[PDB]
Design a binder for this molecule. Structure first.
Ligand code: ADP
Ligand code: ADP
Ligand code: ADP
Ligand code: MG
Ligand code: MG
Ligand code: MG
Lengths: 520, 538, 538
């Protein structure tokens, strides 16, 4: 025989037919996961957990497909999630259609897969132009419009009923992380969960939330003005780096060796008491003896705190990451701490750190979630990532594109009108771009239960005459303009949807053959 | 769409995903339907070898029997998470999600959308939160009514155990909870109240001890057993040998250096014992009448136990982290870890310290304190499952009664809350509400689903559930016009209505609040899901 | 307990047997309800041999697909008895049993016994007969109008095929029962019509033939296919060599006797055929345009075909048993077995007889009869499955139009009887109760279970069932505000009420009788079933 190949070489036209059918199959799984009346999806992972959601990205993380063309479609959700954080299902559902509409031609009119690519870049160049023209700017400092902008994505989720609280929850969190350009990052956004409780009393509080309690019982559970000092090192005597081997000759040496173990922990504790802190947060563990004299000054000792939770404390309290204790000064000590208090919950203890609230480093915060169960917490946490992702685009880009499919439908109309004046060989793939852009409103009408035949016919008749902000009401299923409807989305999500969907088609269209089982 | 992608997979969609969530809900509901109520059936769980553990708590049934269905694991986390923080309302969450799905599924078959149905549950839930403010009643804690706490304790204990165990175990909880209330009004359950296992005469012989009981005693025979006035001392220092960070050989040259060096090795222990002797010299007066006891968190060397035995000092080693955080509350002293700085102020006080042993184990009892800020509940039992049954009963009883002191309100039970919400949702004017369209049946579905809980109590007694609500409905029709505010109940003894205000049946506030909130979230999320699938690498 | 008797046995009792009965009925309902109405979907019964067949009747779907569940076997047997005696309404039986078990199980979960539930169905069933006999209307069939039979046939055939084929085929059904009628004896036979399977132009190119059509052609080429006037002659004895029953053999003495003994068999052939030749010239000798055809059930000797070919005699063989009754009804002849007695009176008459060569076979067509009491229907099609589809359509459509002549009463369709029967079974004041608060639970369950038929039609059309029924209950109520019989229906084109009578939709009287009677009996016995068992020897 010959090399590890040639099992069944899918070559010629049938290879591309399987890819268009495979790419269409990925969109059919989450066809119902779009619009305000979207259905949820419970996926069963093989480890033992469960993922309850409707986001296309979180659905496609858990699924596993043994096909190489569908896996490239699987990776597009990571492009959208780790770029903005909203519209992942929009990316997957649009590309499917682009690959599908271009297929008739590939299969029958024999246009080679390179001429379609040249047609799409001019469509991509024109798509950014009309998306730039259709979008209207909006003021960033208007809190009334910002709340309606944040809740546009929440409306397609379960917590639309609590949208009055989530917009206030997300707006306060984004402004805390926002640095005075206007760059923010979600790594300090703490996703700590508390099972049980009501969503109404759930609120954001400035500062951190630990899972641990104090070590000694005599520690003060209520401090007016805490002074936090971060420690990295072990506060206990440690073995040390080199090969050591003390050799003891006299009887007065072993008690001296055990006595210097007590005096070294005294020396590091006494220099900590030069500034007299109230709360000492150590990264690594703590000894039972050093804690005892940390007590003889008025400090408070905690268990080992992982690094992550200390970098947030450094920005909240204003302290610095300190390992060498001999170089401890008064300037690097945290201050302006609001309040200290420990609540009793049956799961674990929880220590609260509040801030005085009154440029410098960006402040961190922890968002309290009080759901119904464990899956409700993970469901609501992903909604905050989808809701807070919307708040970044308006700050980075003041443009605001219309929602409800009006933006993509505007791309469909202009590409359809300009396709007549684009006479040549590029006309057939260029006109097929509009056929897929008019599907993302078609999916909303199908989920709403209406007839998309007459609605889209009524849409195109009023889109040219009425206005550029016309769209479909997902709840009622009638034509309602986005100006009166009062729901808007950013323009950045529309750019990534058009760019990622077209750029994905240019990769997959160049596939000629599929050969499986070569080597590792 | 999934078969050409994945060569092996399973997919249910648009009719089986709805039937699975309802069928699994009705299946899991039938398991815990019979356990709900006072006359419910017990349930044992014997896993591998035949370990036996007996309880009626739905959390123990769910978190011990492995389950394969994808719906029930969310009901397991929901029933567990609600009980883990609140301590009560486990089966109530399963019955609501167990009933609200089947009560909505009949209308899904009629063709109503799942989105607008769950929209009706959410706006109906907000009406129940507004109804909790008017339905609850204010209670002032300054009165310090012990009879009110006794009736709350019998609500949960009558459900788990019979009247013989309830009457003897009820004042054990009331005496423990009576000390919780103080001027600071800060509740503390885990540190203050504890549970300890002890195989003894019977479950009925459970008694209350005001001080901290310990599961260890004096190792040496000559050390004193009983002490009248024992001043405790807390020391977290370890008095056995300390190994010493890389320190190696006591390189000895002649044979004598050896003796010398062993003696040396001890010197570290005697340096710490001398501080205890110096402390005993300050409190040496009335040495035969008074006494001294040392409690260590880490182990004590057996060579040093003879030092304490000669001075008649009681020794206790290897205590828990929680007990060191409780000696200050019981004895009133202060904690210490090192031996350099000592004083007589940190020493506690105890009026009676005695030890009693059975078989190989030995227990140390402390009680008769001057002003004890904490206490314990030493439960007696025969078998291991008897302790597990008392574990869940005391664990659920303390959390239920403790929540009454957290807030200034209490909710009457016995179906009064569910029957009141039925008339409220079925008689309230819809024009005041903001819901329109096909939200007509969503109000009726959730309002009618609450009725199945109070008749599940009747299903365990064997009476006709529909007939014992006839006079209940007729009572409320005349109660509104009679100008008399009363709340009806469901008495299973005679099969007739009752008043929970005089009978003493009560329920906590956050149980019913968190139950409907957790149940409505889980039931809504299961309705909107229209497809099930399994895929992943393994 | 059953395991002690037979370890290999199983038993589900009192909760698992009820879920099996309801889930199997709902599972059978969810699959088979889609065929109800004109907008229903087509099923492809693809067996292991690759045989494809299109149909919408529930009888043939359940006959080919073997049923594994024990509950659905009882429902399939009910559809068999429904299709056997009536031939229509199988989809209504499975939907009524599924809905009755659904609506009943809704109340069994509320703590109601199955006995009084089934007692209410029987009182509700008897109440419907007292409503049905007043709801029907009487018409005079003596006029034999074609317009009423066409619209009645169009209502039954629209539920099998689309509109353009129904308009072509709906005159074929009305032409089936033209001459088959007897006023005094009230005898009407359905089996006299003959269904021939053949491949031709298209299904939409079929046509009605007045006389009989046989599937046998002329063996010899010399005999004439075109015959202007034919006198039929019925034979039943076989003209070929029949071994003498009593074993025998020709032992010839010499070679000269061989051909003579061969001629002995020729004498018996010529003996019985000489009377046939004498029968021909008895009527008239040398008469052009007057043939003579012979129809024999058994085979014909190929040696004797030369005798029939010389005299221009059409001979057919291997005819069917039931066709012997159809010859005398069409041609007006008389059946004969032997040839001992012959006459011109026993012979029939035919105005036109011709043959057509279609493929490798030839079909004999006999038309132009004077007063034929029977006819036939050619089932032409473009495939194998269209023949079975059109055969089931005719066999289901013949019973709907034949019942109009068996009993003059006829019920309007379009869900009019189910909608009108819902209101009548709401409040039984003091007519037939039997007990207080017991029978009325079954009256409510039976009334709500009958309205699934018009809702299922709306679900297939793709509109909301509650919205289109809101105007409908409303229409009926406004009608009541006038004391007038305005029968309302369900139009699936626009989603609005319509008159069943004016528009053109009817149902047979015996369909609703056996459907409600059969569904109520099966729904009652399955509710009474509390335990399923299996036992036997493998
Ligand atoms: N209320 C609404 N009515 C109509 N269309 C909507 C509505 N909300 C969102 N959409 C449409 O759904 C698309 C996706 O929005 P969203 O659900 O927030 O993102 P994702 O697809 O990531 O869940 C948008 O392109 C928008 O046009
Ligand atoms: N003796 C009783 N009389 C009337 N109602 C009772 C009695 N005991 C318990 N109940 C009712 O049973 C319900 C469930 O009680 P409990 O066992 O504390 O919660 P769960 O069953 O959810 O664990 C409560 O709503 C309570 O009103
Ligand atoms: N054109 C129509 N419009 C409305 N209802 C119809 C129509 N045709 C049939 N039906 C309804 O369908 C029911 C069953 O008819 P049919 O489908 O012929 O029998 P089966 O369901 O046994 O095949 C009848 O009760 C009738 O009311
Ligand atoms: Mg979104
Ligand atoms: Mg309880
Ligand atoms: Mg029919």
């Amino acid at each position: 025989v010959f090399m590890n190949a040639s099992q069944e070489r899918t070559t010629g036209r049938q290879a591309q037919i399987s890819n268009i059918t495979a790419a269409k199959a990925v969109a059919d799984v989450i066809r119902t996961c779009l619009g305000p009346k979207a259905m949820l999806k419970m996926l069963l992972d093989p480890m033992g957990g469960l993922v309850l959601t409707n986001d296309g990205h979180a659905i496609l993380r858990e699924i596993d497909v043994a096909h190489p063309a569908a896996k490239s479609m699987l990776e597009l959700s990571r492009t959208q999630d780790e770029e903005v954080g909203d519209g992942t299902t929009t990316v997957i559902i649009l590309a499917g259609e682009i690959l599908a509409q271009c297929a008739p031609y590939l299969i029958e009119k024999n246009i080679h897969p390179v001429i379609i690519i040249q047609a799409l870049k001019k469509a991509l160049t024109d798509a950014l132009e009309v998306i730039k023209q259709v979008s209207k700017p909006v003021d960033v400092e208007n809190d009334a419009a910002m709340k309606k902008l944040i809740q546009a994505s929440i409306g397609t989720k379960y917590v639309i009923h609590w949208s009055e609280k989530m917009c206030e929850l997300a707006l306060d969190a984004v402004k805390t992380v926002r640095k005075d350009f206007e760059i923010d990052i979600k790594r300090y956004v703490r996703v700590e969960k508390i099972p049980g409780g009501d969503v109404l009393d759930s609120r954001v509080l400035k500062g951190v939330l630990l899972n641990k309690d104090v070590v000694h019982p005599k520690m003060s559970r209520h401090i007016e003005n805490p002074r936090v000092v971060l420690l990295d090192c072990p506060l206990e005597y440690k073995k040390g780096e080199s090969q050591t081997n003390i050799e003891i000759e006299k009887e007065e040496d072993w008690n001296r060796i055990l006595q210097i173990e007590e005096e070294q922990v005294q020396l590091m504790c006494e220099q900590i008491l030069a500034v007299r802190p109230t709360l000492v947060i150590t990264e690594k563990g703590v000894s039972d003896l050093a804690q005892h004299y940390l007590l003889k000054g008025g400090c408070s000792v905690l268990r080992r705190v992982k690094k992550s939770d200390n970098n947030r404390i450094a920005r909240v309290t204003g302290a610095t990451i300190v390992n060498r204790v001999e170089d401890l000064k008064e300037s690097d000590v945290g201050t302006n701490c609001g309040l200290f208090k420990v609540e009793m919950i049956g799961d674990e203890y929880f220590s609260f750190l509040d801030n005085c609230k009154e440029s410098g480093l960006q402040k961190a915060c922890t968002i309290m979630l009080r759901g119904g169960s464990k899956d409700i917490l993970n469901e609501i946490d992903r909604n905050l990532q989808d809701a807070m992702a919307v708040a970044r685009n308006v700050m980075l880009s003041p443009s605001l594109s219309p929602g409800g499919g009006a933006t993509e439908m505007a791309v469909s109309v202009k590409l359809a009108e300009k396709a007549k004046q684009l006479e040549g060989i590029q006309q057939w793939p260029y006109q097929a771009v509009a056929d897929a852009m008019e599907c993302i409103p078609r999916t909303l009408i199908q989920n709403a239960g209406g007839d998309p035949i007459r609605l889209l016919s009524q849409l195109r008749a009023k889109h040219a005459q009425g206005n550029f902000t016309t769209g479909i009401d997902g709840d009622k299923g009638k034509i309602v303009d986005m100006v009166s409807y009062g729901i808007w989305e950013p323009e950045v999500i529309k750019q990534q949807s058009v760019k990622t969907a077209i750029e994905s088609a240019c990769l997959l269209l160049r596939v000629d053959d599929i050969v499986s089982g070569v080597r590792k | 769409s999934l078969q050409l992608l994945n060569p092996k997979a399973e997919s249910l969609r648009r009719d089986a995903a709805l039937k699975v969530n309802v069928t699994s809900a009705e299946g899991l509901q039938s398991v815990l339907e019979t356990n709900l109520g006072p006359k419910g059936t017990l349930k044992m769980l014997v896993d591998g070898a035949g370990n036996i553990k007996l309880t009626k708590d739905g959390k123990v049934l769910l978190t011990e029997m492995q389950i394969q269905s994808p719906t029930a694991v969310l009901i397991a986390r929901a029933a567990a998470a609600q009980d883990e923080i609140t301590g009560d309302g486990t089966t109530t969450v399963v019955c609501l999600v167990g009933e609200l799905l089947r009560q909505a599924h009949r209308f899904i078959q009629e063709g109503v959308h799942p989105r607008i149905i769950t929209d009706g549950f959410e706006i109906a839930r907000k009406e129940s939160m507004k109804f909790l403010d008017e339905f609850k009643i204010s209670k002032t804690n300054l009165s310090n009514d012990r009879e009110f706490l006794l009736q709350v304790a019998r609500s949960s204990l009558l459900t788990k155990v019979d009247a013989d165990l309830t009457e003897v175990l009820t004042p054990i909880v009331t005496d423990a909870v009576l000390s919780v209330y103080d001027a600071q009004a800060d509740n503390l359950d885990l540190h203050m109240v504890e549970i300890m296992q002890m195989q003894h005469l019977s479950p009925k012989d459970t008694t209350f001890i005001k001080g901290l009981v310990l599961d260890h005693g004096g190792r040496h025979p000559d050390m004193p057993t009983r002490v009248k006035n024992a001043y405790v001392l807390i020391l977290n220092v370890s008095l056995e040998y300390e190994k010493t960070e890389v320190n190696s050989g006591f390189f000895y040259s002649s044979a004598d250096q050896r003796d010398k060096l062993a003696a040396s090795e001890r010197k570290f222990v005697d340096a710490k014992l001398k501080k205890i002797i110096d402390l005993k010299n300050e409190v040496c007066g009335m040495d035969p009448d008074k006494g001294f006891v040392i409690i260590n968190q880490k182990g004590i060397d057996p060579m040093s136990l003879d030092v304490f035995a000669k001075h008649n000092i009681l020794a206790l080693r290897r205590a828990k982290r929680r007990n060191m955080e409780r000696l200050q509350l019981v004895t009133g002293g202060e904690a210490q870890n090192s031996v350099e700085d000592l004083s007589p102020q940190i020493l506690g006080f105890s009026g009676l310290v005695y030890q009693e042993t059975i078989g190989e184990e030995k227990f140390t009892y402390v009680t008769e304190n001057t002003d004890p800020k904490s206490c314990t509940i030493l439960i007696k039992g025969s078998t291991h499952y008897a302790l597990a049954q008392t574990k869940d009963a005391v664990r659920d009883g303390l959390r239920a009664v403790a929540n009454v002191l957290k807030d200034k309100n209490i909710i009457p039970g016995a179906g009064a809350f569910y029957i009141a919400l039925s008339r409220y949702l079925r008689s309230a004017n819809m024009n005041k509400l903001g819901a329109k369209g096909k939200t007509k049946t969503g109000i009726e579905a959730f309002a009618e689903a609450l009725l199945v809980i109070p008749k599940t109590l009747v299903k365990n007694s064997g009476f006709d559930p529909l007939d014992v609500l006839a006079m209940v409905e007729d009572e409320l029709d005349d109660a509104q016009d009679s100008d008399e505010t009363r709340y009806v109940g469901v008495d299973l003894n005679i099969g007739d209505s009752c008043d929970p205000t005089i009978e003493g049946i009560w329920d906590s506030y956050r149980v019913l609040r968190n139950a409907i909130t957790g149940a409505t979230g889980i039931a809504s999320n299961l309705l909107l899901c229209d497809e099930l699938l399994r895929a992943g690498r393994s």
